[PDB]
Design a binder for this molecule. Structure first.
Ligand code: 9IN
Ligand code: 9IN
Lengths: 304, 309
């Protein structure tokens, strides 16, 4: 029967065990403690007067290991070393985190999804799933004090960290870096006017989602038409949708085979949906075309 | 404050519950169990075989089982069962080892409309976490596959994990049914594969109002007006849109949010009233085109204030 369909995140336990608090001056934010290293946003070393045009090289050289206070719960972890890697600081501590899970650092591609463990003062608040926007921003829910929180994916027992939160744009969206400290998107960590490129809807994901609805027993939006890749794009682009490529249709191969619905035939269905709307109906409980589920997310939730 | 663009359906951090999940096998039937101190809780149908699910006689099936009939595994280690008993629709297996990861906890029976986080599990291993609401018709719209029974629902009340749900089955309409941690089903359902149907469901009015307050808190207040309504007049309109009747008790539950925004509950009802009769006119609330009903007054305070655990 139907499996049901929820926007689910990965269990956050393996990440919770790595969260700590990092303070420098009067600024306190979150850090990630793996083995004997603690990672956090480099702006932790900024003072109110340094946020407009900071020179992190100059601000950091003025610091020592003891300028940093890291705390795991109520216990202080002594910093015995420090270095800056792009927009992150790597603080070495004198004790290893026994809760460090198997892990790796990965830089995800726009359109891919991940789980965010929102934290404050080194303590977990909640977890939610989201997708990195085509324009590299994240439509997240973050309050002041949330910097340092991380995004991740879990494959079996291995945690793949892919994001660390740094800031909020004038438009209300969020931006951050991978665990190597490199920003996602054309952004810099300073309080200046910065804008993201034009965003688009993740076409691959909307299609994967339409397949999820079908494997779950719903087919009302299908039709007897088909389309070429080119003709589909001429329409989709009018609605601010990401151009679809042959690689994307190949990625949908498995889902296509499981449902018996050709990728291009599903594109024809999407084409009709964009042109006529849903006429008051819903798909998997939604009144809008959902784009935060990748083909992989669908196969894992609807078929293990 | 949150990033002015969408209220995420945030689940509670799941670590404390992940440390309580184990695998329970009886014969060829394997599912999930909850290990707290020296007891492992699981659905009683674990003692059932393929064809013995239409109308199993649990009391009699259990008689044929001994402690050795149960194989419990925490990770790659076997947990020796030294006792077993049935409590309503659950089994309580006593083991010779107290869970070193047992967190402070309590068992609570959730009420209609209230939400909780579900930790989907398979073979004793956590797979995902998501937020769910106990629908007015006593079912939940979850996401479960075979091997998922035994997975649990919970809330974290400060420093205490409050377990409120254990998964048992799926209904023909694609929704789910389960029990509290005392083994008592929510709703009139029973754990046997017979003809069972959930009643017609309604929109959780209390939650929709809570969500509108969250909108205001976030700065999305275009839908507010200078009027008010009577409880009776609101219900006359809302029930037309299949909304659950609003009660004075519900008004009181919204008290903290009403105080935070200075907007009287009936004044918010007036706004909701207009939204239902006039629609949103293409506008959005908290980045949504529809009125969300799976966020409770508590979920709102939790996300807006950034409560931690
Ligand atoms: C994490 C900080 C933390 O935990 O501090 C503990 C002491 C925060 C997280 C944000 C707060 C609100 N939402 C968030 O996600 N990060 C920051 O405060 C950064 C710090 C900078 C990079 C050193 N700053 C911001 O997010 C500020 N943004 C901006 O200044 C942006 N500019 C616009 O809003 C603007 C108006 C005119 O020019 C720009 C900027 C593009 C990055 C926001 C306003 C706090
Ligand atoms: C958990 C079982 C498990 O983990 O087994 C390990 C060996 C499952 C969970 C469901 C699988 C799919 N989604 C789920 O949530 N629970 C069950 O298999 C129960 C077991 C019964 C209570 C002993 N059975 C079901 O969920 C079956 N449901 C039904 O048979 C329902 N009836 C309708 O479909 C119906 C009405 C008239 O004929 C059928 C029944 C009302 C409970 C589902 C189909 C497997």
């Amino acid at each position: 029967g139907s499996s049901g369909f929820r926007k689910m995140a990965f269990p956050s336990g393996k990440v919770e065990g790595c969260m700590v608090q990092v303070t420098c001056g009067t600024t306190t934010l979150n850090g990630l403690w793996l083995d004997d290293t603690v990672y956090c946003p480099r702006h932790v070393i900024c003072t109110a007067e340094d946020m407009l045009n900071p020179n992190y090289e100059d601000l950091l050289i003025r610091k020592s290991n003891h300028s940093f206070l890291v705390q795991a719960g109520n216990v202080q972890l002594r910093v015995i070393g420090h270095s800056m890697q792009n927009c992150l600081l790597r603080l070495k501590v004198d004790t290893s985190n026994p809760k460090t899970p198997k892990y790796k650092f990965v830089r995800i591609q726009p359109g891919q999804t991940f789980s965010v463990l929102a934290c404050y003062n080194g303590s977990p608040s909640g977890v939610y799933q989201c997708a990195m926007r085509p324009n590299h921003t994240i439509k997240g829910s973050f309050l002041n004090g949330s910097c340092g929180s991380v995004g991740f994916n879990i494959d079996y027992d291995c945690v793949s960290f892919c994001y660390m939160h740094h800031m909020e744009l004038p438009t209300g969206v969020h931006a951050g870096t991978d665990l190597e400290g490199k920003f996602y998107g054309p952004f810099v960590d300073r309080q200046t006017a910065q804008a993201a490129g034009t965003d688009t809807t993740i076409t691959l994901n909307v299609l994967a989602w339409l397949y999820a609805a079908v494997i779950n027993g719903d087919r009302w939006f299908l039709n007897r038409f088909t389309t070429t890749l080119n003709d589909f794009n001429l329409v989709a682009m009018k609605y601010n949708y990401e151009p679809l490529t042959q690689d994307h249709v190949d990625i949908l191969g498995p889902l296509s085979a499981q449902t018996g619905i050709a990728v291009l035939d599903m594109c024809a269905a999407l084409k009709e949906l964009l042109q006529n709307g849903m006429n008051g109906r819903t798909i998997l409980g939604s009144t809008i075309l959902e784009d935060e589920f990748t083909p992989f997310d669908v196969v894992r939730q609807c078929s293990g």
